Design an enzyme around this catalytic site. Structure first.
Site, PDB file in Angstrom:
ATOM      1  CG  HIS A  40      -0.460   0.301   2.513  1.00  0.00           C
ATOM      2  ND1 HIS A  40      -0.384  -0.648   3.521  1.00  0.00           N
ATOM      3  CD2 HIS A  40       0.008   1.452   3.047  1.00  0.00           C
ATOM      4  CE1 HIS A  40       0.104  -0.090   4.607  1.00  0.00           C
ATOM      5  NE2 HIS A  40       0.340   1.198   4.348  1.00  0.00           N
ATOM      6  CG  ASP A  89      -0.187  -4.087   2.619  1.00  0.00           C
ATOM      7  OD1 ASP A  89       0.440  -3.698   1.605  1.00  0.00           O
ATOM      8  OD2 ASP A  89      -0.521  -3.354   3.580  1.00  0.00           O
ATOM      9  N   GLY A 187       1.564   5.898   9.406  1.00  0.00           N
ATOM     10  CA  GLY A 187       2.939   6.326   9.282  1.00  0.00           C
ATOM     11  C   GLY A 187       3.910   5.254   9.727  1.00  0.00           C
ATOM     12  CB  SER A 189       2.338   1.113   6.822  1.00  0.00           C
ATOM     13  OG  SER A 189       1.279   0.402   7.425  1.00  0.00           O
TER      14      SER A 189
END
Ligand SMILES: *[C@@H]1O[C@H](CO)[C@@H](O[C@@H]2O[C@H](CO)[C@@H](O[C@H]3O[C@H](CO)[C@@H](O)[C@H](O)[C@@H]3O)[C@H](O)[C@H]2NC(C)=O)[C@H](O)[C@H]1NC(C)=O
Length: 238
Positions: A40, A89, A187, A189
């Site tokens: 993402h 992800d 923030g 990730s």
């Protein structure tokens, strides 16, 4: 990271800071030339020349004696990454060797973190780290890196109807306190979830409902689930 603590220099020497355009993410160095992050994060598919990876960094977007700044050769998102379900992800970056033949130069501040083998870690010492929000809907990302201890959670327990239900799909993993209060936030990730015997990257900070809300533990990409994917995607330019 909500309910976390400022970390010492070198506390997490495997964490990578990713900068491009007006964007930011974290990642985890798994080998001198290889960084793992969330899909993402790089949804927008920036050209690899546009990425800067900073290793051994204490403060978000600050220069530092042991900071190391590398370019990126190439990178790959997981083909099946869904922005509806958030499933699959992760993404894998190949860094660019400097003019000598080296990618990350190991130091006490810059160190890869082993992958797991998934043979599997119910209630060990697990830490998450990041420069994200210190509380949901804060105004700015943190400056100093933050750390928190956070326990693994069973799938049974995490997929409970009043926790996360059937949002939790294969390749996902929960870690957090059901009572809330400590968690990853926006923030964080791409960044590491790390557990110990030995230090291994069990999870990639992925998604969640709020940050450290009751019955809302952080969800993570289950690294162990993707070991084959990672192996077969280690092709690179020369
Ligand atoms: C803080 O975030 C910045 C993004 O807002 C990021 O800027 C990037 O920094 C590097 C310099 O280290 C630039 O890279 C290139 O610049 C010239 C070519 O024009 C060359 O001489 C260099 O070798 C290099 O190829 C990037 O262009 C720049 N990116 C952007 C979007 O401006 C900083 O690196 C971040 N700093 C820290 C300390 O984290």
């Amino acid at each position: 990271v909500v309910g976390g603590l400022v970390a010492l220099r070198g506390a997490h020497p495997y964490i990578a800071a990713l900068y491009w355009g007006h964007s930011f993410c974290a990642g985890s160095l798994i080998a001198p030339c290889w960084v793992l992050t969330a899909a993402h994060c790089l949804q927008d598919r920036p050209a690899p020349e546009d990425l800067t990876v900073v290793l051994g960094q204490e403060r978000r977007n600050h220069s530092c004696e042991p900071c190391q700044t590398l370019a990126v050769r190439s990178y790959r998102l997981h083909e099946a990454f869904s922005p509806v379900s958030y499933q699959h992800d992760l993404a894998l970056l190949r860094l660019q060797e400097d003019a000598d033949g080296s990618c990350a130069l190991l130091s006490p501040y810059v160190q890869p973190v082993c992958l797991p083998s998934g043979a599997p870690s119910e209630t060990t010492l697990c830490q998450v780290a990041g420069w994200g929000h210190q509380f949901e809907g804060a105004e700015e990302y943190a400056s100093f890196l933050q750390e928190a201890q956070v326990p693994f959670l069973s799938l049974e327990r995490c997929s409970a109807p009043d926790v996360h239900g059937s949002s939790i799909l294969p390749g996902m993993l929960c870690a957090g306190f059901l009572e809330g209060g400590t968690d990853a936030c926006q923030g964080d990730s791409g960044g590491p979830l790390v557990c110990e015997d030995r230090l291994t990257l069990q999870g990639i900070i992925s998604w969640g409902s709020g940050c450290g809300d009751r019955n809302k533990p952080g969800v993570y990409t289950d690294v162990a689930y993707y070991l084959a994917w990672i192996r077969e995607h280690t092709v690179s330019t020369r």
